[PDB]
Design a protein around this ligand. Structure first.
Ligand SMILES: Nc1ncnc2c1ncn2[C@@H]1O[C@H](COP(=O)(O)OP(=O)(O)O)[C@@H](O)[C@H]1O
Ligand code: ALF
Ligand SMILES: [Mg+2]
Ligand SMILES: [Mg+2]
Length: 1009
RNA sequence: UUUUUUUUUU
């Protein structure tokens, strides 16, 4: 017997902001006429709405948003505009312009019927070429049979318009994203057939059998895994596992709303996968989980691997740009950024069973774009499952967008978080701001009193609103504090109060950007208490610090040391930093704005939304109880937006339009009209016109081979087009690194707090070239060799030269990626050989010279002309300054060998600044930095209606005739990437003469300079 | 704290 044994001042600013580059594509509606037209519209249609103004920035860099919405009965539609400007006047003009332009394109208002206003011409710049060079031009023109304008037969040089010297002439089904259920011999993650080893005799059922046996074995026998299961069962979301799985199983789309920390991201993917595994079907599951941020995808993937007692690479993986650990091909979970999933769409999503779109409230352009796609995909493929998740969403709006889908409400949280507002913080600390700080703030305010605009009820001071529940002293003190500026005194007092409680735990401080993070770090490190490394370690957290320093925020500190993390919103959602007990929220966020009509970028520090505050708060109360010190008044909190405005509303759309066409999803307008919030129609029009003019789209708005290639590169299309010519000219390596530098906000050189300019050893990297691009190239060439010697050597080198290590790495990784992608498109290795730049050469350098010339194409229309000292002139002689960070910036009376600079960015501060600058020669501008080359009065050749040249008009026409040939060359290259270094002879000679033309001195024949 | 750097891409 027995069972075991039983047998069988500042005038320039407004003028720079009023500049309007694109009225001609928007009905001739421009800055100076839009407000008046809108006033006429408002009078005709009895519209009482006025501009809503929002202050932006600290008091010392105050700007404004202006918003206006108009309901149009005829369309049953509200048209909204939202724009920024240095003051209310510029913001309201830009706002009115957007609104009028939208109304024009929707046929509610007419085109403007008058002529637009097109003085003081700039002095002509002399240009002369050798007879030898001119002969080569003639040979190329003959060889390519190019039409050339003959200015002998150009009569009127009196008082008429300039005459063109270019003839711009060339010479020669919309699908759904593929999907399928799981299939043998297919890797879902790479979208390719496997063909190797043992999915030869191995079916998906056999795999499933193996996974179930293995999991069931571990469930009984693996103590660590057993413990993790016990832990997991106690999470708030476990109470709804079955209900959630049933909803997912029976519906193509589901929404999960659950509190911060309740278990959405760590658990749901496991619930789905384990439900397949335990039922003998583990091989028929493959789950993508998108996160908005890189740190979230990586961090949560690491956690989920640990909950399963595995190494990344088995059932759990991640993929972010430059860094992937892919899981096994069947029965797996891949965490990624939204952008990665959008790039995977090109190859189809065959074999994906479930897509979890996490933190779906973010409203970045990628997330909204993905929602459009996925809604169409579930309609076409009703067996696909999509799961949308957030703590912080309007479920009704998302449910409606998806045709009404299930909404699952998860109650509870892991641990409580005690919340305090500014009043509470002042009262508990007995804070009073110092005499010094009060005087300094009135001093900055009293010089605003001269430049001040009307203070409207939209600029209430919510620090002077407080209930009498608080002491009179608390109220007086609060009323002394700026809402715009961060009081480091208050922060210190709060940190001391936290210390006095004797509660161990890390402190997480949310700040809008780098500048505040590093200023507060310095401030704290200078104190006796917080500067003592035996008591505190202060860690920054920002996207642009080294990867290893980001990882330090998650890690412990020594015994008795308190961790203070000073972080941007990269730590706002998704992540568990396991030792957080206290959150301090400054209640701000930073946006990068772009106004299309004037080409101005700016950074805006704005009030965070209630959504942002709730996510930030939710970094505590995850592993133990916590505290959230929200540094705004209770009345300010009530006045915060529920959410920040969607990115789709304020971003150029041309990259997304290319993606729409690449993925063959049909019409750009139609696709974007299906967005959760459709973008304003003027931005859609701008995008289409840009892509047509760049030749990415043909006459039928279909993708050209150039457009298809550019849609696949992770850079601005204009930089992509520059790369194609780079390849043709044998300098793709240099072009890639410059494109990469032009595509990151991460800065090359470090400057101290309040440092006015680069040090000499940093400027010296430019050598003789007067070029930020060269300085960056040279820095990269040196850094590259130090990186090869190891981490210590790399860091030491960066400290020695004042380089930002993380920037060097990202520029390199992006550059290598671009080159790999060009190789994949068929361009030969030989066109992207490294060429070391020697910055110390004073004079011509053929490979560098053509490289910098091609920047004029990639960064067009950003050409400026040096006037004196830091002052330059941009298009149509608008004033600007050389950015303080440029190697070319000096307060002394510098003169440059040539006055022309190409630049990466035109930034709006208290002044307009040009940033990322390279000196370029006149022919480089004429050839590559121009759309029009016209003959003006008195034989002056005028480029783009403002750069004047004293050059033989006949010669300018000959040079100009090369520009359409260069476009044809790009067509030839994109038709056959593999043949670009063995061109038919007339194109090979074009390449040669253009190299000659781009030599630095080629326009200086017999000229002193 | 006298504004170089919110994010993100095969
Ligand atoms: N690294 C970690 N250490 C300890 N606990 C963790 C860690 N990561 C997650 N958790 C636990 O799992 C819970 C759920 O995390 P997660 O699924 O990321 O929450 P949500 O997606 O709902 O915000 C956390 O509240 C915490 O209790
Ligand atoms: F909802 Al979470 F971290 F993803 F709070
Ligand atoms: Mg989550
Ligand atoms: Mg002349």
């Amino acid at each position: 017997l027995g069972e075991a044994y039983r047998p069988l001042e500042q005038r320039d600013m407004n003028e720079a902001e009023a500049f309007d580059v694109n009225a001609a594509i928007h009905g001739n509606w421009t800055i100076e006429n839009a407000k008046e037209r809108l006033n006429i519209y408002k009078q005709t249609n009895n519209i009482r709405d006025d501009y809503k103004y929002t202050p932006v920035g600290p008091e010392h860099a105050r700007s404004f948003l202006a918003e206006l919405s108009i309901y149009v009965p005829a369309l049953n539609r509200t048209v909204t505009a939202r724009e920024s400007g240095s003051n209310k006047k510029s913001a309201s003009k830009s706002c009115a312009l957007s609104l009028v332009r939208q109304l024009f394109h929707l046929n509610v208002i007419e085109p403007f019927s008058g002529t637009l206003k097109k003085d003081e011409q700039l002095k002509p710049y002399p240009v002369k070429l050798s007879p030898n060079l001119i002969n080569k031009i003639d040979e190329v023109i003959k060889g390519l049979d190019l039409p050339v304008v003959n200015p002998r037969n150009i009569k009127i040089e009196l008082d008429g318009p300039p005459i063109p010297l270019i003839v711009n002439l060339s010479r020669i089904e919309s699908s759904v994203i593929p999907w399928a259920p799981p299939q043998a011999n297919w890797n879902t993650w790479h979208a390719c057939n496997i063909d190797e080893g043992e999915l030869a005799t191995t079916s998906i059922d056999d795999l499933s059998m193996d996974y179930e046996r293995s999991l069931r074995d571990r469930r009984q026998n693996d103590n660590e895994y057993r413990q993790f299961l016990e832990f997991r069962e106690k999470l708030p979301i476990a109470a709804m596992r079955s209900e959630i799985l049933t909803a997912i199983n029976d519906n193509p789309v589901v929404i999960i709303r659950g509190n911060t920390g309740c278990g959405k991201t760590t658990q749901i993917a496991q619930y789905i996968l384990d439900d397949y595994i335990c039922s003998g079907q583990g091989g028929y599951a493959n789950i993508y989980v998108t996160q908005p941020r890189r740190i979230s995808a990586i961090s949560v993937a690491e956690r989920v691997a640990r909950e399963r007692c595995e190494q990344l690479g088995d059932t759990v993986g991640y993929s972010v740009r430059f860094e992937s650990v892919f899981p096994r091909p069947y029965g797996a979970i891949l965490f990624c950024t939204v952008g990665v999933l959008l790039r995977k769409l090109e190859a189809g999503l065959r074999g994906v069973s479930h897509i979890i779109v996490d933190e779906i409230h973010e409203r970045d352009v990628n997330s909204d774009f993905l929602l459009v796609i996925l809604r169409d995909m579930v309609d076409t493929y009703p067996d696909l499952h999509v799961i949308l998740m957030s703590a912080t969403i309007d479920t009704t709006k998302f449910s409606k967008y998806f045709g009404i889908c299930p909404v699952l409400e998860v109650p509870g949280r892991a641990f409580p978080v005690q919340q305090f507002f500014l009043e509470d913080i002042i009262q508990m600390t007995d804070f009073v701001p110092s005499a010094e700080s009060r005087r300094k703030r009135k001093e900055v305010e009293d010089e605003e009193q001269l430049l001040s605009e009307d203070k409207d009820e939209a600029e209430i001071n919510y620090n002077k609103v407080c209930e009498d529940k608080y002491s009179q002293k608390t109220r007086n003190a609060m009323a002394m504090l700026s809402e715009s500026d961060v009081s480091f005194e208050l922060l210190e007092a709060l940190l001391m109060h936290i210390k006095s409680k004797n509660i161990p735990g890390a402190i997480l401080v949310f700040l809008p950007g780098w500048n505040l993070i590093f200023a507060l770090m310095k401030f704290l490190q200078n104190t006796n208490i917080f500067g003592d490394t035996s008591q505190y370690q202060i860690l920054p957290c920002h996207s642009q610090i080294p990867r290893d320093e980001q990882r330090k925020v998650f890690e412990p500190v020594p015994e008795g040391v308190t961790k203070i993390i000073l972080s941007t919103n990269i730590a706002e959602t998704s992540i568990t930093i396991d030792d957080i007990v206290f959150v301090i929220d400054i209640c701000k966020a930073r946006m990068k704005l772009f106004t299309s009509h004037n080409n101005l970028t700016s950074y805006a520090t704005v009030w965070a939304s209630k959504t942002n505050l709730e996510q930030r708060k939710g970094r505590a109360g995850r592993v133990r109880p916590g505290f959230c010190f929200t540094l705004c008044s209770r009345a300010r909190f009530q006045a915060l937006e529920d959410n920040l405005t969607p990115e789709m509303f304020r971003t150029p759309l041309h990259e997304m339009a290319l993606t729409i066409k690449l993925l063959r999803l049909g019409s750009i307008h139609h696709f974007l009209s299906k967005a959760l919030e459709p973008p304003p129609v003027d931005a859609v029009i701008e995008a289409e016109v840009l892509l047509r003019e760049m030749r990415c789209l043909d006459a039928n708005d279909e993708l050209t081979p150039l457009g298809r290639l550019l849609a696949r590169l992770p850079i601005e299309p204009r930089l992509g087009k520059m790369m194609v010519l780079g390849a043709v000219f044998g300098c793709a390596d240099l072009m890639a690194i410059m494109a990469s530098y032009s595509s990151t906000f991460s800065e090359v050189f470090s400057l101290d707090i309040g440092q006015r300019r680069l040090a000499n050893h940093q400027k010296a990297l430019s050598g003789t070239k007067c070029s930020d691009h060269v300085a960056m190239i040279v820095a990269s060439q040196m850094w590259r060799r130090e990186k090869q010697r190891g981490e210590h050597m790399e860091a030491r080198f960066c400290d020695w030269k004042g380089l930002q290590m993380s920037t060097m790495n990202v520029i390199w990784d992006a550059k290598q990626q671009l080159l790999d992608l060009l190789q994949q498109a068929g361009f030969p290795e030989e066109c992207m050989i490294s060429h070391e730049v020697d910055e110390r050469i004073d004079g011509d350098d053929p490979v560098l010279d053509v490289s910098l010339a091609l920047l004029c194409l990639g960064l067009y229309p950003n050409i400026c002309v040096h006037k004196e000292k830091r002052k330059v002139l941009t298009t149509e002689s608008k004033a600007a300054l050389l950015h303080k960070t440029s190697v070319n910036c000096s307060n002394l009376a510098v003169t440059f060998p040539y006055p022309f600079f190409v630049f990466g960015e035109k930034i709006r501060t208290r002044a307009v600044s040009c940033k990322q600058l390279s000196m370029v020669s006149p022919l480089q501008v004429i050839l590559f930095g121009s759309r029009k080359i016209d003959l003006a009065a008195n034989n002056i050749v005028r480029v783009d209606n403002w750069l004047n040249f004293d050059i033989e008009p006949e010669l300018a026409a000959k040079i100009g005739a090369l520009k359409p040939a260069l476009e044809d060359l790009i067509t030839v290259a994109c038709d056959n990437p593999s043949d670009i270094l063995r061109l038919e002879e007339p194109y090979a000679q074009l390449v040669k003469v253009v190299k000659d033309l781009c030599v630095k001195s080629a326009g200086d024949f017999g000229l002193q300079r």
